[PDB]
Symmetry: C3
Subunit: 340 residues, 3 copies
Amino acid sequence: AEIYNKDGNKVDLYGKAVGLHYFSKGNGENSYGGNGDMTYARLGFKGETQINSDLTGYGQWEYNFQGNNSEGADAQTGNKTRLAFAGLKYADVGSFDYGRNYGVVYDALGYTDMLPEFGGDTAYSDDFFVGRVGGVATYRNSNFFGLVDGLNFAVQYLGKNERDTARRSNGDGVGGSISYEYEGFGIVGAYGAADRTNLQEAQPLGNGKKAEQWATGLKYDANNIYLAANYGETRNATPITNKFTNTSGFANKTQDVLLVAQYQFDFGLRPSIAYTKSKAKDVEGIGDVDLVNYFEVGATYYFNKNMSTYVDYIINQIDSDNKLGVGSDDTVAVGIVYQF
Amino acid sequence: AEIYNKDGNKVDLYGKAVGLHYFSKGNGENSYGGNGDMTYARLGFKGETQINSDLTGYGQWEYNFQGNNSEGADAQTGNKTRLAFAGLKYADVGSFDYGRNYGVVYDALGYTDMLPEFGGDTAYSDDFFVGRVGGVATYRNSNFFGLVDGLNFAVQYLGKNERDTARRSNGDGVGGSISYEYEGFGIVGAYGAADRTNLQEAQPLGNGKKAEQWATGLKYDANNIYLAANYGETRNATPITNKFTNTSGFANKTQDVLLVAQYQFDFGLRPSIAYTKSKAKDVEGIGDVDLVNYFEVGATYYFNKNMSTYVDYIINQIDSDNKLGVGSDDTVAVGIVYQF
Amino acid sequence: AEIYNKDGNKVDLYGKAVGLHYFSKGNGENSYGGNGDMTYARLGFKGETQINSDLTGYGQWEYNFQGNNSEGADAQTGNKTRLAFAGLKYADVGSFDYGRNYGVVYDALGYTDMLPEFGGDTAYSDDFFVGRVGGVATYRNSNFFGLVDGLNFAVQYLGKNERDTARRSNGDGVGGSISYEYEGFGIVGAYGAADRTNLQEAQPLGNGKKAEQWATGLKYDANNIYLAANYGETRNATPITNKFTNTSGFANKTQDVLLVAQYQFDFGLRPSIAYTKSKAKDVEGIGDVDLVNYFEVGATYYFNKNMSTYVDYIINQIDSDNKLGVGSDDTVAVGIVYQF
Ligand SMILES: CCCCCCCC/C=C/CCCCCCCC(=O)OC[C@H](O)CO
Ligand SMILES: CCCCCCCC/C=C/CCCCCCCC(=O)OC[C@H](O)CO
Ligand SMILES: CCCCCCCC/C=C/CCCCCCCC(=O)OC[C@H](O)CO
Ligand SMILES: CCCCCCCC/C=C/CCCCCCCC(=O)OC[C@H](O)CO
Ligand SMILES: CCCCCCCC/C=C/CCCCCCCC(=O)OC[C@H](O)CO
Ligand SMILES: CCCCCCCC/C=C/CCCCCCCC(=O)OC[C@H](O)CO
Ligand SMILES: CCCCCCCC/C=C/CCCCCCCC(=O)OC[C@H](O)CO
Ligand SMILES: CCCCCCCC/C=C/CCCCCCCC(=O)OC[C@H](O)CO
Ligand SMILES: CCCCCCCC/C=C/CCCCCCCC(=O)OC[C@H](O)CO
Ligand SMILES: CCCCCCCC/C=C/CCCCCCCC(=O)OC[C@H](O)CO
Ligand SMILES: CCCCCCCC/C=C/CCCCCCCC(=O)OC[C@H](O)CO
Ligand SMILES: CCCCCCCC/C=C/CCCCCCCC(=O)OC[C@H](O)CO
Ligand SMILES: CCCCCCCC/C=C/CCCCCCCC(=O)OC[C@H](O)CO
Ligand SMILES: CCCCCCCC/C=C\CCCCCCCC(=O)OC[C@H](O)CO
Ligand SMILES: CCCCCCCC/C=C\CCCCCCCC(=O)OC[C@H](O)CO
Ligand SMILES: [K+]
Ligand SMILES: [K+]
Ligand SMILES: [K+]
Ligand SMILES: [K+]
Ligand SMILES: [K+]
Ligand SMILES: [K+]
Ligand SMILES: [K+]
Ligand SMILES: [K+]
Ligand SMILES: [K+]
Ligand SMILES: [K+]
């Protein structure tokens, strides 16, 4: 909510409280999403200052507070900063920001990342260009320097992050995206490539000096209708785990497909259906293997812009003999959300 | 403080900074509260949206930031989310919320939880129904569907939380409360029972498949006077430690009594006296033993609704030969509070 | 930003988002500041209530969120409360506050702590009187009871903090400062002494029952010109370590000098140059050794009061064979800052 607006600067303090519970058979270890309390809250700020008629500065920070920990030793589990960045934007010239922000391939993956609770499976955090990541410099242009309404593009430099785990590390890289969005119609392409670190190359799963991710998307988003599809491929970039050898690494190759269809009734009910499949190829000791494979059915009821409730049912198509030990059981989430 | 109120939604951002110090002889290991700096701060939001004339949605998050840690490796000690939940309240039919919230037995223990600093000794956090707890679904009714002013009841479902420690864990359970309040007089009773997890049963102290907690309360709150008392008992629910054998678990039985008397002078000073005693029975290898036993004298001076200062003296009646090694020395707390 | 002001209470919710990157050769281990992404955010509140015409109450809390961590196991690295205190101020009698706050010798060190990104090297956190510390009670007096404009002094009591590390510990102590400012000129002095804890005394480096810190300062601060010098000495108070081994402790003596010169152009550019040298003496097994030794050239460009950008170049004079393994390579920081 806008809590401040004076003398050229405005500040939006926002957040939400989500009462959230997952249901899956047994103890949830062999299911899509687990089971139990999944309650959490968010808090963030977003600010924008008018420097002159054409130039604006901005900054944003957003944090995740888990609500399903005790007040004991596990208190901090799953807590983190999601975003933290600042930037400048000028009229029709474009914008530039640096910090922790979305990687550019998410410009495409956002198309299908629309489910009430799940979905968006290939948009991993700290995974090069497909999700939120640290140390990215991003230039964006809207409406092609003012010449073409609906045409956007972006260019992004990812600085290396040599962390303690292969999973969360990355080398230097660059990526970009282009989209055209007009009267409800949208089409997007995005690509990114980067060096892998020594720690990454040392894991038994995944082999290569460079990581690559790309995706395309199509959508129609108008008249209470939302339809969208994504297709993309990755090289040495999707994190995986072989549960039978207790080993982790990256998929040599993946091909990823996502589909979503939603409809919003005037009285506030928004039913949702979706399909997601991500498969890995040339995985050491395995070959081909599904990582994600399901149909979704769900719905959100919007009381208003501040309050909603939802159910999200994942009909999990992973098989009980999945070679990596990916969970094969269904999961249903039920949530109630206050937000501001 | 209300920092947003527009289009049917209002948001309160609140918090406080508490400069706080405890004094006890020695290093304070053998005292009621310990000694040293105990400064902390809090931040939270509380939101309420009017959905229509009969229906409101709401959400709340609250966090504790310790102010007595270094900026080094102990930085996070004692920090946690206290509350995180969202809910709906309908006309005279009731409210429902889910998330991290107060267990229903605290509906009773709230009566004596009124001391400037100490007190409320039996309202443990992450302990089934007596304090803040994770994954509780709570139904509350005010004025018995509109028919009886002052008559309230609550029914509460506690989802299991199989955590890393027995102390912070619980199995599935249900609880309830009922209270009548009128013109300053209050009377209340509350009860809940839950399964214990495998990890709790495996602890050396405490035996049985079910945990139970109940309490009764009476109070008078009006005319500058506050008088209240609680009596309750627990089974397999109160966490304890044998400091001699470094063993932990739960007391097979406790009975608990709390008394408080307070008076508020118009000029700001509010003296307080209290008595608190919690005793355990059938404790493995010990039998009967007092967990808590003291008289309290203290006072708060309110400068106004935002600034106050207080002193709180605990005259500890625990004996130096206590069988569980519960601290016997006194503690005095001194605090200065700014809040918003 | 002031987000609430009503009925004699006002609340400032403030913060910033800083995209920040450091460049140093190799992996940054042997450099002044390290290398890589250093992005972070701050959030805080500052509140003030008018109790009566002469009496005011106040509280402040301030927190650092690192933006250069992943969302995995390392998420909390470097996160901490910086300040948490509350207090009262009366007419021309003075102010008193208690909690986590700045030690009084920082009243002197503030003179040179003015660089775009670095500098202020001797104002250590959790280090007796030179930086932020927990459990300090501080009296401050403005304009000598209102009789001498520009004359200010402070007296401070530091309660003991026995922590798990000697680095972050302290015993009881007292300090004070005094300063005079007239027509752009300022002179300041500050001194503190305190007991060392047993754990501090057990460390291989540094010998004595008392830690002492003092610093003097001169500045000229007017007509867009900023010039300042600090001279100070410490005894058993400056923390030191050998980079290559476990040996750690405090320097028996240090001699500290800091110089700064800056000019603020009306259009927004503020170039900066500086010199900092901190040298330890009588170090067990070593004798004399430089802790800090550098020249700085940098600049901040201010778009307005909410947006700025900077570069800060540390030209490191520390030698590659420094006895304590102090990093010898340069570091440059580049930053973009949105604040409210
Ligand atoms: C119009 C929308 C109104 C719809 C409101 C619906 C309320 C849903 C309640 C879910 C309870 C959870 C039940 C537990 C589900 C079983 C776990 C599971 O999915 O696996 C079983 C197996 O797959 C065979 O289906
Ligand atoms: C798989 C990757 C797919 C990527 C696909 C990216 C789309 C690229 C579009 C380029 C040029 C389109 C030219 C559009 C020129 C429009 C001219 C104009 O500005 O008119 C607007 C209209 O008249 C206002 O009403
Ligand atoms: C006085 C005025 C000063 C003007 C200063 C203007 C520059 C502003 C830059 C903003 C953010 C800089 C963010 C830097 C992002 C680059 C990340 C990077 O360089 O990665 C390196 C790679 O990992 C290994 O070489
Ligand atoms: C379970 C799987 C089911 C999911 C199925 C997903 C199908 C995906 C389609 C993608 C893009 C569609 C692009 C269609 C282009 C729309 C343009 C259009 O129809 O314009 C109408 C106009 O606005 C009227 O006024
Ligand atoms: C548009 C209005 C309609 C609202 C639409 C969304 C709300 C419904 C949610 C419930 C879905 C329940 C269906 C789930 C049952 C599937 C279980 C299953 O098939 O999986 C078994 C597994 O294979 C064993 O091995
Ligand atoms: C489109 C319409 C959307 C419809 C949405 C329907 C309800 C929504 C929200 C309610 C959340 C309440 C969650 C309550 C969780 C209680 C269950 C529980 O605690 O289970 C523990 C477990 O059984 C241990 O064994
Ligand atoms: C451990 C003990 C637990 C006990 C828990 C409490 C039990 C309460 C029962 C409620 C009775 C309702 C009697 C009060 C009804 C008042 C009459 C009425 O209906 O309204 C009055 C009206 O306001 C004119 O002033
Ligand atoms: C079930 C448990 C119930 C517990 C019951 C707790 C109350 C106990 C009272 C004892 C004596 C009562 C003596 C009351 C003395 C009142 C004196 C007084 O109030 O004077 C009035 C004055 O004229 C105008 O303020
Ligand atoms: C350590 C010493 C602390 C001991 C504290 C124990 C007191 C317990 C009281 C319990 C219930 C109080 C019920 C009393 C109800 C009286 C109602 C009343 O006073 O009526 C006022 C009248 O309506 C307008 O003058
Ligand atoms: C009803 C009115 C009650 C009046 C209450 C006034 C409160 C004033 C200030 C509060 C806290 C200040 C605490 C000061 C603590 C300083 C450190 C200290 O005293 O001790 C360190 C320890 O002794 C090492 O041996
Ligand atoms: C009105 C009430 C006033 C209360 C506030 C007054 C505090 C101010 C102290 C000034 C210090 C200026 C510098 C201190 C001088 C350094 C002492 C010193 O040189 O110590 C020697 C060292 O041990 C090697 O011998
Ligand atoms: C041995 C001696 C060596 C000789 C070296 C001398 C060379 C001087 C260089 C000055 C450059 C910058 C001067 C800028 C002029 C200041 C104008 C000004 O500052 O006023 C405008 C406002 O301050 C801002 O917008
Ligand atoms: C913006 C208006 C124009 C203002 C322009 C201001 C330029 C100021 C230069 C002073 C530099 C002092 C730096 C001193 C460096 C000494 C260190 C040294 O002697 O050696 C470093 C060498 O790089 C080791 O290899
Ligand atoms: C809800 C409590 C009733 C209100 C009382 C107000 C009396 C005021 C002062 C006396 C307090 C001591 C009496 C409270 C003791 C509770 C019962 C108890 O402690 O246990 C003995 C009992 O016979 C079975 O255990
Ligand atoms: C040489 C110092 C400038 C380097 C800054 C790096 C920022 C990078 C890109 C933005 C440049 C826009 C700033 C160019 C300076 C414009 C000065 C101006 O117009 O503002 C003056 C002031 O507002 C009157 O009050
Ligand atoms: K490999
Ligand atoms: K490969
Ligand atoms: K399946
Ligand atoms: K047991
Ligand atoms: K038992
Ligand atoms: K005692
Ligand atoms: K020593
Ligand atoms: K010494
Ligand atoms: K400017
Ligand atoms: K050097």
